[PDB]
């Protein structure tokens, strides 16, 4: 589990945790302050973190659309202005075996156990090695509308293309 801040925004810490073998997606989804992000559409930290940035910039300097920053990051993670669609494609599904648990807000201890209370699944390090087991490229290409001529050497290549998309909001 990682707590982090964005340089430009030291007043705001954010907590990400990654879960395997989640057995109660629908339990969660149905009975939903966190954001539960579907890691099939996240492939890197560069991706996740740029979308957080964009979220803050948006609430600080432009306009806030959703109820909270957790939602707004789900929105900002997507390459669309439609909220319901971003929630749907970037939020957990009922078939979600993995998820990213996210929130914005100092108590690492209470969090780690507020989460595992919600998620009947196995926590694992929020890092790139872990994220690049569960992203679904073809699914990404669908959602982020990528030409089949676009053929990156590796995940950085992919990531970049999504940062671009996330950033041109």
């Amino acid at each position: 589990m990682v707590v982090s801040i964005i340089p430009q925004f030291p007043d705001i810490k954010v907590s990400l945790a990654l879960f395997e073998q989640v057995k109660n997606a629908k339990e969660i989804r149905s009975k939903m302050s966190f954001a539960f992000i579907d890691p099939r559409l996240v492939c890197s930290g560069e991706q996740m973190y740029s979308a957080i940035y964009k979220t803050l910039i948006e609430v600080k300097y432009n306009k806030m659309r959703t109820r909270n920053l957790n939602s707004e990051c789900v929105l900002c993670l997507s390459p669309t202005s439609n909220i319901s669609d971003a929630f749907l494609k970037f939020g957990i599904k009922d078939d979600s075996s993995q998820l990213i648990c996210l929130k914005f807000h100092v108590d690492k201890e209470q969090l780690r156990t507020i989460m595992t209370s919600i998620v009947k699944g196995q926590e694992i390090e929020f890092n790139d090695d872990n994220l690049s087991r569960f992203y679904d490229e073809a699914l990404i290409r669908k959602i982020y509308k990528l030409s089949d001529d676009f053929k990156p050497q590796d995940v950085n290549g992919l990531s970049r293309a999504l940062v671009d998309a996330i950033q041109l909001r």
């Binding site: 982090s4 340089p7 930290g45 910039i57 030409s147 970049r160 940062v163 950033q167």
Partner: protein, 224 residues
Amino acid sequence: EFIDKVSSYLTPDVDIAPISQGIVFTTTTHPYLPQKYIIKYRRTLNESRLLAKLYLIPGLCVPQLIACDPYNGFIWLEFLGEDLPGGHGFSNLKNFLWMHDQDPYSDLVATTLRKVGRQIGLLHWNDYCHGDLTSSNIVLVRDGARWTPHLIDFGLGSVSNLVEDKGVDLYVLERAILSTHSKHAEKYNAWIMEGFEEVYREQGAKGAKKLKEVTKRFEEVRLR
């Protein structure tokens, strides 16, 4: 002080280092992730969009768009280029060219220069335009012992299939190389051209025709 406003904007958290004006910085701080970077403050929105599109063209080398605040006019671009050894300066094409000016008869310069044209060929084949193609707006990245050309500041850039626009860009470049007034200036441009032609001469019969058209236009523009 404008620096005051900038500094206040990114907070003390971000070290900046002014670099150019009329405004650009450096920073070793990444805008969101836990070496060196670029910040443009100011039009920009144009540059960002483009950079995104350009990235997606296979082969075309351009700065990574890292972050973008369109509401205040900030873009963090990746840092490309290093310093030529022996104080020959920052590794854009001008400096590279001045550096090798008395000794231009090598693969390094010619193949580095053909590569440059490959980038422009690429850019134009996809109906894009730089619109400020100076020798200072082409920075060289080190790849082992080869050099790899990239293109930069797409502020005054656009998307265009107007053959005249492609001729102007070429002209701006060839003109900038001729600006130095080197004896070897003519060759450089020939070599950049080779790499341009090489690229079109690849896309087949389509290529040759479209190439022939831009070739004639350029000659015309050089003539005007």
